[PDB]
Amino acid sequence: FACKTANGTAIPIGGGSANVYVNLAPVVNVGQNLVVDLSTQIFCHNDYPETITDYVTLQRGSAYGGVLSNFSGTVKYSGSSYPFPTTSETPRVVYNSRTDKPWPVALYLTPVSSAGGVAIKAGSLIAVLILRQTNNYNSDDFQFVWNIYANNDVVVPT
Ligand SMILES: CC(=O)N[C@@H]1[C@@H](O)[C@H](O[C@@H]2O[C@H](CO)[C@@H](O[C@@H]3O[C@H](CO[C@H]4O[C@H](CO)[C@@H](O)[C@H](O)[C@@H]4O)[C@@H](O)[C@H](O[C@H]4O[C@H](CO)[C@@H](O)[C@H](O)[C@@H]4O)[C@@H]3O)[C@H](O)[C@H]2NC(C)=O)[C@@H](CO[C@@H]2O[C@@H](C)[C@@H](O)[C@@H](O)[C@@H]2O)O[C@H]1O
Ligand code: NI
Numbered sequence: 001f002a003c004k005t006a007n008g009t010a011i012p013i014g015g016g017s018a019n020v021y022v023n024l025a026p027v028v029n030v031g032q033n034l035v036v037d038l039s040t041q042i043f044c045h046n047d048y049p050e051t052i053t054d055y056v057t058l059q060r061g062s063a064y065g066g067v068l069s070n071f072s073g074t075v076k077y078s079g080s081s082y083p084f085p086t087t088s089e090t091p092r093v094v095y096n097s098r099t100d101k102p103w104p105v106a107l108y109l110t111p112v113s114s115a116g117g118v119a120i121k122a123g124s125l126i127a128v129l130i131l132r133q134t135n136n137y138n139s140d141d142f143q144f145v146w147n148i149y150a151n152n153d154v155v156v157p158t
Pocket of ligand 2: 001002045046047
């Protein structure tokens, strides 16, 4: 089991960490959501699907920087919605093919009433999403830690 990004970085068998940059709507009002869909950027596969089933959760999602200070959020994982930052590890998604499948995570971030001006700075860390991978075969229990960075400034008009 391993993962890669559309930019080309990879996290190998056994887990590890990678940085992912995302494009953000440059203007967002109170009552509107920024949607950060990672399913177009993070892809994973099972290396031995004939004999092993891989189980994949969103173990935790954490906010940083301007998202932590200026937004409230939800995360959608595989069709179910949860608070973001998260309050518990999600149910598992089965990975059962060598063919890359997206990691089905999307953040929905909405400005708090005190947000105004540059609410997320270009280049800054906005979130960490931890993918936990286990299987039905051995003791393997690995973390794939995705550090999410804003490409661009996001402004909340005053
Ligand atoms: C009828 C019968 O029972 N046949 C059994 C064979 O099927 C069995 O072969 C196993 O098959 C498994 C697949 O289920 C393989 O596990 C994978 O191994 C990957 C690493 O393999 C290389 O490195 C090994 C040494 O470390 C070396 O032995 C191999 O030759 C390879 O070069 C590993 O990366 C992979 O795990 C990753 O991917 C999965 C799926 O996505 C994730 O869930 C994991 O988290 C991880 O990311 C997986 O573990 C074995 O490679 C393969 N071995 C061989 C030699 O072909 C054999 C093997 O014996 C078994 O393995 C040893 C170590 C020991 O525990 C034995 O008791 C086991 O039975 O046995 C036959 O009987
Ligand atoms: Ni592979």
